[PDB]
């Protein structure tokens, strides 16, 4: 059933001898050569350099909070950089942050000690994780940190960074405490005067170059992904592709996910219109998102496959016809020396004859074939 067109005709006709005529055997199809995913250019980008490349950092008890929205958040440069000692993602894998959107992303930056870096994670315990910054067990996001000894450490001690030692209750997730009030740890009351049982709850890190790795300053930024009912504001940059035209390619333009061959178009869109449509509610032209231009799409070429053969008793030679297919795209029959073209389609295995004789086998579109000396 798959050796030669005459054999493909015999299988469909369920007969060893095939009468003279034109018989449909299969369906021609042009498969997608490749896949392209084109999305609008990054243009305005999330300014993660405002937090990561910030000149000064806040204390852990006074951790800064920045809202990131209405921008594309590129993360390839983040986890590729080797300057970061800690890069841990909880509840999500590094690949999909460039594919998943969230309504809000929070950048929470502060400075802690080297041995306190492990304390920023769900289900963590310690002085920082209980009195300075608490993370929920269902936290969605990543915690990133990098060594900052060359900046936040000063000879003789840099005391600009402070941390809380005591608190009556554990800090709730995503909570801040700037109380800086005289904490009480005894039955004796107090009136804001330092004494035997009256203590200042704030102590400052001693950051010195000679300190150990566990005693070195470490700048920490926590990125908090979160999805609410309101539609997402930050979408990761979908991987851009090279535009390919005149070749049948699977395409994905902002979720169109259509199949066909794209060519440069002529119709004019209004600037607010993103993709065209035909009468039958089938996508017909698409505005290219990277650069503002119009691309007319047409379906991948397909058509019936017919076998034009005389009686099998008369001959075994056959000629195939691919209806509604241009002759160039056909090769995607072994007698490829002669390839005639007609309005009906691409006729392989026969030769056009300038002379005209009465028709017995109708090819289609006015042309007809026949066995001849």
């Amino acid at each position, epitope marked *: 059933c798959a050796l030669d067109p005459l054999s493909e005709t015999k299988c469909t006709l369920k007969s060893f001898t095939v009468e003279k005529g034109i018989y449909q055997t299969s369906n021609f199809r042009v498969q997608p050569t490749e896949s392209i995913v084109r999305f609008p250019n990054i243009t305005n980008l999330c300014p993660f350099g405002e937090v990561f490349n910030a000149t000064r950092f806040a204390s852990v008890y006074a951790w800064n909070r920045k809202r990131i929205s209405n921008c594309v958040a590129d993360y390839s440069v983040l986890y590729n950089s080797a300057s970061f000692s800690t890069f841990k993602c909880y509840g999500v894998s590094p690949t999909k942050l460039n594919d998943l959107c969230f309504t809000n992303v929070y950048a929470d930056s502060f400075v802690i000690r080297g*041995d306190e870096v492990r304390q920023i*994670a769900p289900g963590q315990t310690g002085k920082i994780a209980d009195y300075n910054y608490k993370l929920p067990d269902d936290f969605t996001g990543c915690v990133i940190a990098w060594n900052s000894n060359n900046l936040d450490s000063k000879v003789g001690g840099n005391y600009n960074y402070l941390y809380r030692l005591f608190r009556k209750s554990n800090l709730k997730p995503f909570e801040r405490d700037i109380s800086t009030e005289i904490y009480q740890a005894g039955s004796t009351p107090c009136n804001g005067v330092e004494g035997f049982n009256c203590y200042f709850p704030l102590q400052s890190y001693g950051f010195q170059p000679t300190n150990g790795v566990g005693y070195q300053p470490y700048r920490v930024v926590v990125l908090s992904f979160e999805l609410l009912h309101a539609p997402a504001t930050v979408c990761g940059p979908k991987k851009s592709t090279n535009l390919v035209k005149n070749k049948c390619v699977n395409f994905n333009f902002n979720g169109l996910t259509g199949t066909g061959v794209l060519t440069e178009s002529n119709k004019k869109f209004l600037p607010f219109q993103q993709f065209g449509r035909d009468i039958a509610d089938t996508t017909d032209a698409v505005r290219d998102p990277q650069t503002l231009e119009i691309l007319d799409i047409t379906p991948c070429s397909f058509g019936g496959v017919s076998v034009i053969t005389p009686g099998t008793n008369t001959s075994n030679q056959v000629a195939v016809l691919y209806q509604d297919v241009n002759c160039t795209e056909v090769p995607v029959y072994s007698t490829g020396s002669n390839v005639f073209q007609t309005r009906a389609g691409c006729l392989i295995g026969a030769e056009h004859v300038n002379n005209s004789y009465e028709c017995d086998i109708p090819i289609g579109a006015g042309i007809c074939a026949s066995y001849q000396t």
Partner: antibody
Amino acid sequence: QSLEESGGDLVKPGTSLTLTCTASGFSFSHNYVMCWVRQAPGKGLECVACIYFGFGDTYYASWAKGRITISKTSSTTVTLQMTSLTAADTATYFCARALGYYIYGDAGDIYIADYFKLWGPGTLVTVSS
Amino acid sequence: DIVMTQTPASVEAAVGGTVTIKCQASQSISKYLAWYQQKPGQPPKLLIFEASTLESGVPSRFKGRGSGTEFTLTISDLECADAATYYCQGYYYSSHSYVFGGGTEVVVKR
């Protein structure tokens, strides 16, 4: 912060017993991985089976072929079930808490639940006629 | 598919001495190692994680080194309370599995 075990007692061979751990001070979020560590009287420890709340799937040890079942019944309960109890099941069973996190690597992205931090007192399970 | 071989079965030293614990990974475990101290009738307590980082609250004498298939734990200035059973657990991310070692017993010579 606290993990407590229950359900261990003397059970005849061939029947089934259930073991339960309760989450107090925290909830069974997707960021946590729960496993069972069993040690025999005067012997070493071994991992029975594990459940990942992130994916909802469960991994089992090689020595068990459908004999062990894990099901997180609620946000503060995860149950264990051992069938076809034999003398090899006479041991003390513990349950602890782990964390699952993702790191970008050359080959791809891998899930890490490396070490175990906080545990529970454990319940002794004895199998005899 | 992983076996943590722990040698020797026991280690001894006087007060203030040094005892080493040798743990071998049959297949490469990389950096997912932990050490645990366990007393009879009490749950294992984490000493070292990452095989090079001190758990919060543990004394500095509990030191761990090694990577790949050779994992080490040395105790300095042995105390009377250090007499317990120590284990090494390597997490193989390839099979998402935990395997424990045979165990090491600490004896305080006197």
